[PDB]
């Protein structure tokens with residue numbers, strides 16, 4: 001199971017948000033920390049992504065594009081996984097030192113988006129997602145959103161995507177006899193991956209609005225963050241870059 | 249970008 005050996009071997013480690021719990025919760029403090037966390041996890045993503053099977057085959061420019069357009073959905077997915085394995089999707093485990101309880105969910109002014117994130121978190125349990133399905137599914141997320149015109153080398157991006165889809169397909173097909181369960185498992189998981197997009201765009205909208213008035217609410221933005229939210233996110237929000245859905 | 253780009257072509 002070479003492909004799996006690789007995914008498991010290159011999975012990023014535990015990342016701390018550097019949040020000062022001793023401080024009273026406050027919109028600015030919570031968001032400033034999520035943005036710092038966002039900036040840190042972004043580093044691991046780039047290293048994780050580049051060590052992916054057949055990834056460096058993509059034109060160096062499409063490597064930036066895909067990473068830049070899909071980090072939100074990737075980070076939200078993993079985070080939903082950490083939540084599920086730690087605080088059992090009861091709360092939201094963004095980082096070891098930044099766990100969201102109902103109070104903080106309301107305090108950050110994103111309770112609505114958090115409710116949907118926690119739902120996703122529960123899905124891992126309800127659907128009994130295995131550690132292997134999670135990894136193949138999360139790889140797929142990286143290839144799940146592109147510009148409507150196409151990347152530098154679109155022909156090749158689609159190839160890589162096909163292979164990753166075929167992998168998630170084998171992961172299910174292994175340890176499973178006959179064929180309606182497989183066919184059924186594949187339907188549930190592609191539906192799960194789809195449900196990630198709607199949540200992602202909500203956060204894109206939220207963070208963009210946030211950055212614009214950041215200096216009014218005292219919320220800090222790291223440099224790659226403030227950079228990506230105004231140079232790549234705007235094109236997702238304006239319909240230039242679009243998610244690739246499995247189902248209609 | 250510029251800081252992102254560097255982490256990649258790295």
Ligand SMILES: C[C@]12CCC(=O)C[C@@H]1CC[C@@H]1[C@@H]2CC[C@]2(C)[C@@H](O)CC[C@@H]12
Pocket residue numbers: 031034035037038041072075076079093094095203206207210
């Ligand atoms: C991706 C992060 C940070 C990494 C993670 O575990 C998921 C979480 C989802 C909400 C994001 C946050 C990064 C900073 C954002 C984008 C805030 O600006 C508003 C929404 C926040």
